[PDB]
């Protein structure tokens, strides 16, 4: 379960310099970003798959987020586990709460209208696990993902049959900053 993918995503609106570094390593500066998602992780997601990582540096300048993303088909699902975020905590519709990994966090659903997709030009959904608090920069992490995937189904959200990739995610919106991350 050694990472194998590499995602550098971005709207084409700003300056986003990410680096692929060696291993699990990756690295991203930006100044004022429109949306990007860079991170590294592996092409298909499992339910069961413990994801650790560490954050060297998370620096946002306005609203970034650190997390676990990815997306399933039939149906096409957008997911987020958000550890870490700057000055905009990311919530949706209030579903209840999953305990994993040392941490609380509120589940949201949400949905998008006509958006940017795996799948082109969608209107599709957005699973959430958002921490309650922030968690630490610096320290290794890890995320039972089936917790969440478990918690998800408890509360009427079942992911798609069909996995794409996964990823520990460094996201920004309308933002500057720094972000160095490990992933293993």
């Known amino acids: ?25 990756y690295s991203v500066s930006w100044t004022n970003c429109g949306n990007f998602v860079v991170g590294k992780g592996w092409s298909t997601g499992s339910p069961s798959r413990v994801v650790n990582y ?4 998370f620096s946002p300048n306005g609203n970034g987020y650190l997390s676990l993303y990815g997306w399933t088909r039939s149906p096409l699902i957008e997911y987020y586990v958000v550890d870490d975020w700057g000055s905009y905590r990311p919530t949706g519709t209030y579903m209840g709460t999953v305990t994993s990994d040392g941490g609380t ?17 969608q209107t599709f959904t957005q699973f959430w696990s958002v921490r309650q608090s922030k968690r630490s920069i610096g320290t290794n992490n890890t995320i039972t993902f089936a917790n969440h995937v478990n918690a998800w189904k408890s509360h009427g959200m ?17 933002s500057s900053g720094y972000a160095n991350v490990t992933v293993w």
């Open 158 to 174: 079942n992911l798609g049959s069909s996995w794409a990739y996964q990823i520990i995610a460094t996201e920004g919106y309308q």
């Open 105 to 121: 966090y509120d589940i949201y659903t949400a949905t998008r209208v006509n958006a940017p997709s795996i799948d082109g030009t």
């Open 54 to 57: 560490n954050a060297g540096a």
């Open 1 to 25: 379960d050694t990472t194998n993918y590499w995602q550098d995503w971005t709207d084409g609106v700003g300056t986003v310099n990410a680096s692929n570094l060696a291993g699990g390593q």
